[PDB]
Design a protein around this ligand. Structure first.
Ligand code: EAE
Length: 353
């Protein structure tokens, strides 16, 4: 198709999605060449940026629906702040190259990245990342969100699907008659600032994906940057073991697993929560001898039990993870503090770049 003709021939479906396929253009500039993702928000497509010598971008095209348009405007405000504050592009938040309003569709152009860390784990038959990879990805997440936290921002939806490799090319360790895979370059970027909240802005009550959600959110006690620290702790567990720390889809059971894995919920948090129906006389309501009781009993053990090795680097990892999974968000380690944790003495100079 021709740039001008294609960019002006435009229509939406009954749901407010842009009708488009591979080959279509936007802004006499972006040529759609692949599909990367879709949701209720809209769609993400790979494009060639013909105004920047056909360099590759991920273009997010938001639905022509007021709720999603407004949310996208707020997302752009966050991305603009990140860009304003990271002139060397060294804080590892996804680079927004362009944004525009295409017939009511907010569109955001990003640098093109590789597979997300969940997809890579799944392609490795959920065999975990080796500890040095866990350590480098942890360092990068602490560095990226410390920067976001210094700028009165909280991501609120950190999960492995929102952490992408710059380049996900892998090496084969073994291929016996699942092919065992390690990523070559563990450089990552954080994506999807579509839930990211400034300190002064309205806070959505229930944030984060289930498995990465902290106790102060479940208990509706208010949340801020420590929410993201809890998420990171859960992510690092999952990188290290290949399975989620909290495999549950119900609040009371989730809070029970937290107490079995991490120790007792602080008294003051139970006193203050409106979620009183989960408690009786200050203790979580929980039948140990039911089927769910036996699953939790068998599967949810003290955090340290999940160590695969007893050496110093594993002990250091678990100390940092424990500090990231403090119940009380006011006692939870900050990412500025996390960057100084002795776990990160095991990095190399390349890994500090
Ligand atoms: C589809 C994932 N995805 C995004 C998703 C959202 C909701 O923003 S943004 C993004 C940027 C680059 C990329 O490369 C592969 C992927 C990418």
């Amino acid at each position: 198709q021709s740039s001008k003709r294609s960019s002006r021939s435009v229509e939406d479906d009954k749901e407010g999605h842009l009708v488009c396929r591979i080959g279509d253009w936007l802004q006499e500039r972006y040529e759609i060449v692949g599909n990367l993702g879709e949701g209720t928000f809209g769609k993400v497509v790979e494009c060639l940026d013909h105004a920047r010598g056909k360099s590759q971008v991920a273009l997010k095209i938001i639905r022509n629906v007021g709720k999603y348009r407004e949310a996208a405007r707020l997302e752009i405000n966050v991305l603009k702040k990140i860009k304003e504050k990271d002139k060397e592009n060294k804080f590892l938040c996804v680079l927004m190259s362009d944004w525009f309003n295409f017939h009511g569709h907010m569109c955001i152009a990003f640098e093109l990245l590789g597979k997300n860390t969940f997809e890579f784990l799944k392609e490795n038959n959920f065999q975990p990342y080796p500890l040095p990879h866990v350590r480098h990805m942890a360092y990068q997440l602490c560095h990226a969100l410390r920067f976001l936290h210094e700028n009165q921002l909280t991501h609120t939806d950190l999960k492995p699907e929102n952490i992408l490799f710059v380049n996900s090319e892998f090496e084969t360790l073994y291929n016996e008659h699942c092919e065992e895979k390690s990523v070559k370059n563990t450089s990552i970027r954080v994506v999807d600032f579509g839930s990211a909240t400034f300190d002064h802005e309205h806070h959505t009550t229930i944030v984060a994906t289930r498995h990465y959600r902290p106790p102060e959110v479940i208990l509706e006690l208010g949340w801020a940057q420590p929410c993201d620290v809890w998420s990171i702790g859960c992510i690092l567990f999952e990188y290290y073991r290949g399975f989620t720390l909290f495999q549950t889809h119900e609040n009371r059971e989730h809070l029970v697993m937290m107490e079995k894995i991490l120790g007792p919920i602080p008294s003051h948090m139970i006193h203050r929560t409106r979620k009183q129906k989960y408690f009786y006389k200050g203790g979580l309501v929980w039948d140990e001898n039911s089927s769910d009781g036996r699953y939790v009993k068998e599967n949810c053990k003290p955090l340290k039990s999940y160590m695969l090795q007893d050496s110093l680097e594993h002990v250091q990892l678990f100390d940092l993870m424990r500090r990231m999974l403090e119940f009380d968000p006011a006692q939870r380690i900050t990412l500025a503090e996390a960057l100084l944790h002795p776990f990160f003495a095991g990095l190399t100079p390349e890994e500090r770049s």
